[PDB]
Structure formats: C-alpha cells, structure tokens
Design a protein around this ligand. Structure first.
Ligand SMILES: *CCC(=O)N1CC[C@H](Oc2nc(-c3n[nH]c(=O)[nH]3)cc3ccccc23)C1
Length: 270
C-alpha cells in the first residue's frame, strides 16, 4: 500500500504465534502474514546490523528465487527493531537436525541434503552472488525434510567485529580456505571450500569440524596443507567430492555446476 516499496512489509499484517529461537541478530518467531501465510519473523537487535546497507541489498536478495534458497519476503523498515520476513522452515537448523540421532538417516538422505545445498549454491554462483558464510548452521530444513540455504550474504552487515575479521573470536575459521585465513581473499572458491566442509558436517551428523583443535590450531593445520578426513558414513566417491573442495590452489577447486554433476553421478551409482 501507499507508504510501502516492493521490499517493505506492513508489520500490522503479521500475527505472532510461537518463539522459534535466538541467533546472531536476536529472536526468530513463527507467524502468519494476512492471517493465512506461514512466515519466519527475525527481530534485528538494535546495533547488531548495518541496517541501511542491508535494506539496499534486501532489494537484490528479493529477486534471488530458487526452490533450495530460503526466500526473503521483505523487511519491516519503519521501526525499532526492524523485522526480516522469510520463508518458514518448520524443522529448523540443519546442524540441530543432523545431531538428532532419532532420525537414523540413510546415506541416500545425507546425499540429498548435499544436492539441495549444491543446487542453491549453483544458482547463487550463476548470479555471481557469494554466500560468504556457508555452513550447516546457516541451512534450514522444512516440514518435508528439504534442506535450503539461508542468510546468503548477510555476514556483510554484521557490526560485531569478533565475527567479521579472520582472527576475530567468532570468525568461521573452520569453514575458511587458506587464502581467506592468510589474506582475506574471498571468492567463488571460498564458497566451494565451505561447501566441502558442509558436506563433511552432513556425513559426520553435525560434528564440529576439527573438533579436537582450537581455531588457531585449525588455521595452522590447513595452512600446512592438512585436511579433514573421511567421515565413516561417506563412501570413497562422496569423500572424493568433499576433498576436491579443499585444493590448496583455489583455481583447482571445482564449480558448483561440476559438484552438482558429481553428486548426481554418485546418486545414480550408489
Ligand atoms: C542453527 C541456526 C539457529 O540456531 N537458529 C536459531 C534461530 C533460528 O531458528 C529457527 N528458524 C527458523 C526459520 N525459518 N525461516 C527462517 O528464516 N528461519 C525455523 C525454525 C523452526 C524451529 C526451530 C528453530 C527455527 C535458527
């Protein structure tokens, strides 16, 4: 209506139904838009986010639509705190989902989770959009068990310096290639590295990568050319795919298109 751009949701159209959890920017709630449509409502804690830069980028993120990307519906801008309105994912965080041993996953289900994420990332790569923080903690699971990539590019708007620089206490060291840790070289190939680590998280049922090491020890390990090794649930062919993501030379890592082809080959063979 009158006072609203295409990227802007009237918060008066929201019904709040359940508290889901709290993350980086604060509380997430389940609700309805205009009485009918399931939404997630992220209440952005004051001072957590570069809000004007985020809102400008929200316009670009609105046009990123792929069935394996958590859809951005819009933002509630006129207020404190602002709200980010997204596709509701009833089964929550992929990391928590993997750690629930009751699911008793088949390796075919784990490969489907890798394929879901890989389709999302191939789409983002096709639009020259980097995720910049790909990990199981940034994937969500819907009521049908479909995995979707969430919070793509949002790390750019985090004001907490512990999260944003390589030797920050909250930087994702364990998902980062050597060139990111050594001189902050972000590229398509740092998303590829992260995707390899996400495949390892899935096949490890949500173990922490390098779980016996500190961030400092992890950085030294990977800089010296040492790597994660094969999760017990990963076949030789699955391990070959995740390992291909960790070539010391970034230009020798595959694309998301090549990874998707390799994952579809294994699905057919295994
Ligand atoms: C692993 C990530 C994490 O810790 N979270 C805590 C806050 C969030 O919880 C959460 N989010 C959603 C959701 N749906 N669409 C979104 O953009 N976020 C759904 C959901 C369902 C059940 C429990 C938590 C939860 C993520």
């Amino acid at each position: 209506g009158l006072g609203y751009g295409s990227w802007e949701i009237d918060p008066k159209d929201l019904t709040f139904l359940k508290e889901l959890g709290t993350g980086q920017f604060g509380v997430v709630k389940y609700g309805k838009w205009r009485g009918q449509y399931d939404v997630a409502i992220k209440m952005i804690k004051e001072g957590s986010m570069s809000e004007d830069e985020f809102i400008e980028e929200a316009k670009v993120m609105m046009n990123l639509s792929h069935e394996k990307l958590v859809q951005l519906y819009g933002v509630c801008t006129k207020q404190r705190p602002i709200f980010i309105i997204t596709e509701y994912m009833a089964n929550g965080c992929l990391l928590n989902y993997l750690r629930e041993m009751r699911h008793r996953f088949q390796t075919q289900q784990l490969l489907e989770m890798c394929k879901d994420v890989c389709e999302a990332m191939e789409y983002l790569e096709s639009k020259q959009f980097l995720h910049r923080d790909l990990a199981a903690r940034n994937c969500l699971v819907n009521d049908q068990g479909v995995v979707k990539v969430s919070d793509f590019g949002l790390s750019r708007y985090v004001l907490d310096d512990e999260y944003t620089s390589s030797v920050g206490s909250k930087f994702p060291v364990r998902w980062s290639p050597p060139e990111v840790l050594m001189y902050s070289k972000f590229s398509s190939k740092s998303d590829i590295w992260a995707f390899g680590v996400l495949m390892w998280e899935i096949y490890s049922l949500g173990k922490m990568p390098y779980e016996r090491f500190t961030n400092s020890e992890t950085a030294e390990h990977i800089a010296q050319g040492l790597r994660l090794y094969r999760p017990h649930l990963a076949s030789e062919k699955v391990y070959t795919i995740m390992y291909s993501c960790w070539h010391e030379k970034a230009d020798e890592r595959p694309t998301f298109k090549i990874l998707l082809s390799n994952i579809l080959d294994v699905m057919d063979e295994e």
